[PDB]
Design an enzyme around this catalytic site. Sequence first.
Site, PDB file in Angstrom:
ATOM      1  N   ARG A   1       0.785  -1.215   0.000  1.00 50.02           N
ATOM      2  CA  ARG A   1       0.000   0.000   0.000  1.00 50.02           C
ATOM      3  C   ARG A   1       0.835   1.292   0.000  1.00 50.02           C
ATOM      4  NH1 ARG A   1      -5.059  -0.621   3.686  1.00 50.02           N
ATOM      5  NH2 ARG A   1      -5.354  -2.891   3.878  1.00 50.02           N
TER       6      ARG A   1
HETATM    7  N1  LIG Z   1      -7.759   5.927  -6.745  1.00 51.18           N
HETATM    8  C1  LIG Z   1      -6.816   4.968  -6.600  1.00 51.18           C
HETATM    9  N2  LIG Z   1      -5.850   4.824  -7.538  1.00 51.18           N
HETATM   10  C2  LIG Z   1      -4.871   3.899  -7.466  1.00 51.18           C
HETATM   11  N3  LIG Z   1      -4.756   3.018  -6.460  1.00 51.18           N
HETATM   12  C3  LIG Z   1      -5.747   3.076  -5.405  1.00 51.18           C
HETATM   13  C4  LIG Z   1      -6.821   4.059  -5.416  1.00 51.18           C
HETATM   14  N4  LIG Z   1      -7.527   3.822  -4.286  1.00 51.18           N
HETATM   15  C5  LIG Z   1      -6.918   2.768  -3.634  1.00 51.18           C
HETATM   16  N5  LIG Z   1      -5.841   2.310  -4.322  1.00 51.18           N
HETATM   17  C6  LIG Z   1      -4.910   1.225  -3.953  1.00 51.18           C
HETATM   18  O1  LIG Z   1      -5.425   0.359  -2.946  1.00 51.18           O
HETATM   19  C7  LIG Z   1      -4.645   0.458  -1.761  1.00 51.18           C
HETATM   20  C8  LIG Z   1      -5.472   0.514  -0.521  1.00 51.18           C
HETATM   21  O2  LIG Z   1      -6.020   1.793  -0.478  1.00 51.18           O
HETATM   22  P1  LIG Z   1      -6.815   2.052   0.855  1.00 51.18           P
HETATM   23  O3  LIG Z   1      -7.713   3.345   0.646  1.00 51.18           O
HETATM   24  O4  LIG Z   1      -5.824   2.092   2.099  1.00 51.18           O
HETATM   25  O5  LIG Z   1      -7.718   0.749   0.926  1.00 51.18           O
HETATM   26  P2  LIG Z   1      -8.662   0.617   2.183  1.00 51.18           P
HETATM   27  O6  LIG Z   1      -9.947  -0.207   1.758  1.00 51.18           O
HETATM   28  O7  LIG Z   1      -9.050   2.003   2.860  1.00 51.18           O
HETATM   29  N6  LIG Z   1      -7.770  -0.233   3.371  1.00 51.18           N
HETATM   30  P3  LIG Z   1      -8.648  -0.398   4.863  1.00 51.18           P
HETATM   31  O8  LIG Z   1      -8.879   1.053   5.539  1.00 51.18           O
HETATM   32  O9  LIG Z   1      -7.835  -1.461   5.755  1.00 51.18           O
HETATM   33  O10 LIG Z   1     -10.059  -1.047   4.493  1.00 51.18           O
HETATM   34  C9  LIG Z   1      -3.644   1.583  -1.935  1.00 51.18           C
HETATM   35  O11 LIG Z   1      -2.361   1.317  -1.389  1.00 51.18           O
HETATM   36  C10 LIG Z   1      -3.720   1.951  -3.397  1.00 51.18           C
HETATM   37  O12 LIG Z   1      -2.712   1.247  -4.104  1.00 51.18           O
HETATM   38 MG   LIG Z   2      -7.938   2.457   4.791  1.00 52.04          MG
END
Ligand SMILES: Nc1ncnc2c1ncn2[C@@H]1O[C@H](COP(=O)(O)OP(=O)(O)NP(=O)(O)O)[C@@H](O)[C@H]1O
Ligand SMILES: [Mg+2]
Lengths: 161, 501, 102, 470, 232
Positions: C69
């Site tokens: 991430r």
């Molecule tokens: N708009 C985007 N463009 C490219 N990559 C993205 C985008 N959104 C998320 N990602 C990828 O997905 C990963 C996780 O993003 P994240 O917003 O931390 O997921 P998350 O569902 O919030 N994790 P969590 O809070 O444990 O549920 C990142 O490290 C990015 O690589």
């Molecule tokens: Mg998150």
Amino acid sequence: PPVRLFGVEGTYATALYQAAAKNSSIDAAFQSLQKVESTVKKNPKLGHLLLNPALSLKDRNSVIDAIVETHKNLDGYVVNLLKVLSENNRLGCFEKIASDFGVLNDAHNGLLKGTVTSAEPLDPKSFKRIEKALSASKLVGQGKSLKSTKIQKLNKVLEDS
Amino acid sequence: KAQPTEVSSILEERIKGVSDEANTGRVLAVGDGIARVFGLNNIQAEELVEFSSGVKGMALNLEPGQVGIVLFGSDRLVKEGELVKRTGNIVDVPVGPGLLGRVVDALGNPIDGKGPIDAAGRSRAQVKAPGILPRRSVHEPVQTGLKAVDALVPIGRGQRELIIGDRQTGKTAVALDTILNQKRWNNGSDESKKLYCVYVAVGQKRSTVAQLVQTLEQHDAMKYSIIVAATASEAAPLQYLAPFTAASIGEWFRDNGKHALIVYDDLSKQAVAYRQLSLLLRRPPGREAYPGDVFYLHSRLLERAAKLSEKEGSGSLTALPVIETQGGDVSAYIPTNVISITDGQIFLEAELFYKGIRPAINVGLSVSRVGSAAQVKALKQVAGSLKLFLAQYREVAAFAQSDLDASTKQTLVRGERLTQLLKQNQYSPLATEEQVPLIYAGVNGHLDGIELSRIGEFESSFLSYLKSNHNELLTEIREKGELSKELLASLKSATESFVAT
Amino acid sequence: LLERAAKLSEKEGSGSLTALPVIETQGGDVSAYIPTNVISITDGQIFLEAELFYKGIRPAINVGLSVSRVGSAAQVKALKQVAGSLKLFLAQYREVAAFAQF
Amino acid sequence: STPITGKVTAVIGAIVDVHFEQSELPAILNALEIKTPQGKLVLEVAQHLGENTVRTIAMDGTEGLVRGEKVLDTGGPISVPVGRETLGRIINVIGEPIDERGPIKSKLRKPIHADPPSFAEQSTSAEILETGIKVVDLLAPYARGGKIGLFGGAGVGKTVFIQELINNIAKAHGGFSVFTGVGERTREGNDLYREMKETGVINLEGESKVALVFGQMNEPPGARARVALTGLTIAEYFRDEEGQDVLLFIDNIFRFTQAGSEVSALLGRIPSAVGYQPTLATDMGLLQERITTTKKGSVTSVQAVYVPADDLTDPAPATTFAHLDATTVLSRGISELGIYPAVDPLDSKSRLLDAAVVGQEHYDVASKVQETLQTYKSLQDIIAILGMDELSEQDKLTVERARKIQRFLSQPFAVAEVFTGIPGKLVRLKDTVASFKAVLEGKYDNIPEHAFYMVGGIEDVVAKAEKLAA
Amino acid sequence: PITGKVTAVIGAIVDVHFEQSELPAILNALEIKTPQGKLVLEVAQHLGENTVRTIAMDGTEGLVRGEKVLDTGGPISVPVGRETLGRIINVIGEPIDERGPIKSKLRKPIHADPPSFAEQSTSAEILETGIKVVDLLAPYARGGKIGLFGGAGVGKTVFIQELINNIAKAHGGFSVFTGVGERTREGNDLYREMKETGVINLEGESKVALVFGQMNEPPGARARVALTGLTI
Ligand SMILES: Nc1ncnc2c1ncn2[C@@H]1O[C@H](COP(=O)(O)OP(=O)(O)NP(=O)(O)O)[C@@H](O)[C@H]1O
Ligand SMILES: [Mg+2]
Ligand SMILES: Nc1ncnc2c1ncn2[C@@H]1O[C@H](COP(=O)(O)OP(=O)(O)NP(=O)(O)O)[C@@H](O)[C@H]1O
Ligand SMILES: [Mg+2]
């Protein structure tokens, strides 16, 4: 009183201590509680008839009232102790109620704990520091058969190195 | 081995005296919406009680030493040792028409700033269902205005049709259009033909309810509807009680020779509530942690709905319980129970929904065990063919992908048009005399010529034309409720004229 | 435990602690209790797979499911430069290789 | 000074029983304090066990606690400072600062438990809040005053999404905003505080537009279970007493339910299904129903919702749905295609998608886009098995158009530049609808699929189309 | 007349106390008198200290602790014999068709002993039903058990009535229809349809006794009705 003594099983003797601590009625309760246990354990008669899950509410109350009228020291508030345990089904643990009554008198008017070997003296003066020092010197010289703590500690230190 | 009630504090009271108070009860402990109370020895099972602080609660477990009372309000209000007063009262509720157009909580209290309810009387939340004897067979339609439902899944008065589907499929919309469609009669004169609405909101966001109110008032439907509100944030008992509470409100009309219909939105959440109470009362759990009598909960509720016999005033109560599947699981514990109590289901699917088929009614899965007997004879006249056609259209559906013979080609020609004809924007339920023409032109093949996108504007223009140039046939359908051999040639002629034009 | 891994600020000495927890699944199920817990605690995962292994991908990393991430922030600039799009491409590759089965 | 004293009688993990003198118990939800070597330890009364004993939950670590230790009744619920004094500050669950900038000098404090507004205090409005994000504003548009959940299994892009929202919404917003970090990554919080400063939203030597409330997963259940209400109270105060517009950001609201889960049994409750506490429904209800637009003022909330095991029918998220005006469902399947944000265009919904609110054209475009993709989804069986070959011509085109559309729904976020190296593009709601309208009528059938992927408005589709054909 | 007191009420589970060795055996009918008529309680356990645990046959709302409870000195018993034909009866052997009490000559406990290994049939044997399909393809056991499958739209009740008629007409034996977990609607239908088909004959003679135990009734009721009917 600040003694704790559990909180469900140990509250049987503490409940009646509140009513027995009025008009000087704690002294007569010690010798009366011992007569209930002694005439049931080493009697083989009323033990097997009361420890069973038969009888009735009225039958349990009549048996306690008839024994108490011919026994030593049972005409004050002692009759009320047995009645409470008969209706609530608690006659099987009569040794627990009598044991927890004696601990109240010995904690607020004496010392407890232990030291080494057998028991200590259990003085009723005031503070525990001035009592233990004056009793340790007199009980070490008189008696003390000594039949090890220092030897065990020294051996363990040499095997770990 | 050990027990509660008399413990430490409560145990050091009977040793000094076996009297003290000549009476009421004393809270031994409180937490998690439950309070354990000493005494209240004359209390009835399910008696409402009141606490020193003023919060009410009901007594559900009557145990040897203590009573187990469930709270109606925050238990921050309750403390150990507090006094509790019997109210000598099994939960009841005000009932009667002074309630129409009102928004109450589950105990009958007004939650809409409109002053006291004028109650024709009071009924206990719990009541025996009408037995084997004082019922007649369901025979009068509940006309919902929804083409798909009225035509293919006909609901009778006294029936129990279940609305079922996953979240966000359209369940409330189906119910709400039934409610909105009653203006046709409720604004009229004839009692036996009106239908009073009762919407039981369970564990919904208050802002939702507020808006559901603001929606019926926008259609002048409030005037004949009752909202019993047991919103997301209220004590579980209230969410448990609300449907029975509202049940007894309905029966008022049933018992008084009138007709209500009652929407339970939803039973899923009522069961969840009952669960909360039980577990906390430490009643023993089964499948998914529901108590044994979770069935008995819902059977009691829905068996209260009926068509009463002539001797009973022939009144009626119809039931629209809402049940929320999870990923479509009809085997799920609660949906099983409820499906096996009701007289059928209206079945919703987000798949059909994203296709654009709204109402998103799965026809193949929806049944009404009452069925035939409850249909405007006229609608049942031009639609005995409809379930037939749409059945065969479901079976040759995958053939929609180059070399099909004219028979199974044709079957795909009706089906698409027919399915299109049963789409229906929200809030616009159709009058029967407005359904039967469209379902007629459909079934008897007057749309096969028309393209599939124009079936939209077809309905609008047909009906407004029929209104101006054939208002008389429409009038006969609305009045006679059946179709003459003449009326069939009338409609036929008027259709062939519009389809040619 | 896992929060105790962090990369301190300059004021605090710029020291880092980096964590590679390991977790063992059963039958590939990642939806079992503990894996689920940790999966959402960490800054990404590397999924290893038995099927991949036996057909010769070793490390049996599952590109499809593995993420970091932090991402490119911790790649070396040179590696980053020539790895432009590789991971997405490798996905498109599984895509076309699934359609190849036709 | 009229202080009430008790003594600790048990410690079992995060549960601390306390004993007080005769009928003189602090009520449920009251805070207690223990003065420890480093700081204080806050407790919260949970039950009245009887015999003058209460069960508490600890707002901290319970190691080092000695039975028989003095406990002090604060006399009321946990208190937070409120008002404009919380602007630019970071706050922990117990209304104490954690930014080391000194004490939060407000005139009022407030209990973090409070009652949810009466049925009659509610305010219904169908107003629309433009995000800049193509798929939301087209398909499931967020409602000003509304509540807005972001469902997503782990690492599908929730936190990034929510930050993209803050990046856009929280500038153009005239009023104040609270952000609540409920059981997330201490470092995510770190970033935000350093972004706020650099976006300008925070200013440690001047005016700030946002309050920061943190209770990350590095912290014990009791703490993780109340810091939502801590944040939520600060919002409430601006809503009701600053009589104005708030934006309430919670990430992640699922940890309020989870934390509830982690102590449930220690408080002696039989587990309900999927081992969740018996009080899931009503507990969530009791919080969510406070987060609400009322006649005194308006809140608008964005809550990330963790969907455990990617299972949407998991009792926790499954319950949350009922609480939100607009639901944005992120999907692993989507994200795995490189389609960011991971929004599921079909399963996403918002009440405002109704002609009455957005106009017919908007509603028609939005419906057709949906029909398109639904068809394309339905045909993926026949595409796998009999190729693209074996198709009706209308179908072949529907698929051609669906694929072009899938891509036009992605979009480079500004926040996510570290991931795409592509500059953040923001799209205007009218530009969204127009371009999709165009796409839908075929006025773009010649342009290759890649030209719609990770770009802004239809300008960018043309720009890319040519730049690539070069 | 043996008497007790209600000591605990928890949904359909009531607890009753007694006097020394008067405790009714398990599977006994205990009655509490209600404003309506009588609530019946079946005994499940002797918990000790002269207490029995019962399961209710109806609701328990309004029960107060310490209420009179009479022991019937038996299990739940039903009217038996000819007097039950054309009658509607419930779990606790009561008329529910509002046509007086069933005036039976006996009454019999709903709990009984299966016919010993002695009283057994040594040979399997076909029961003639008169239905071609049945007799030819799926012939019935005499004293056997036949699983009947299918919901509505298939003339289930007509077919049932046919067998009641045909077992009466061809052989010369009665029928007992038991409704376990009944939907009440269908009880009203059945009852009417039966009269309409004249297998029930209010004026002449019936061929079938009806024992209903509907959904709305509590779990104890719904368990015992099968036996209630079977006994008959
Ligand atoms: N708009 C985007 N463009 C490219 N990559 C993205 C985008 N959104 C998320 N990602 C990828 O997905 C990963 C996780 O993003 P994240 O917003 O931390 O997921 P998350 O569902 O919030 N994790 P969590 O809070 O444990 O549920 C990142 O490290 C990015 O690589
Ligand atoms: Mg998150
Ligand atoms: N016939 C229809 N035409 C157009 N839109 C509809 C129709 N029926 C429902 N909707 C819309 O689709 C959405 C779902 O309908 P809804 O009545 O909320 O179903 P539901 O089962 O009650 N969803 P919920 O109970 O909130 O989980 C609503 O936002 C409506 O605006
Ligand atoms: Mg709904």
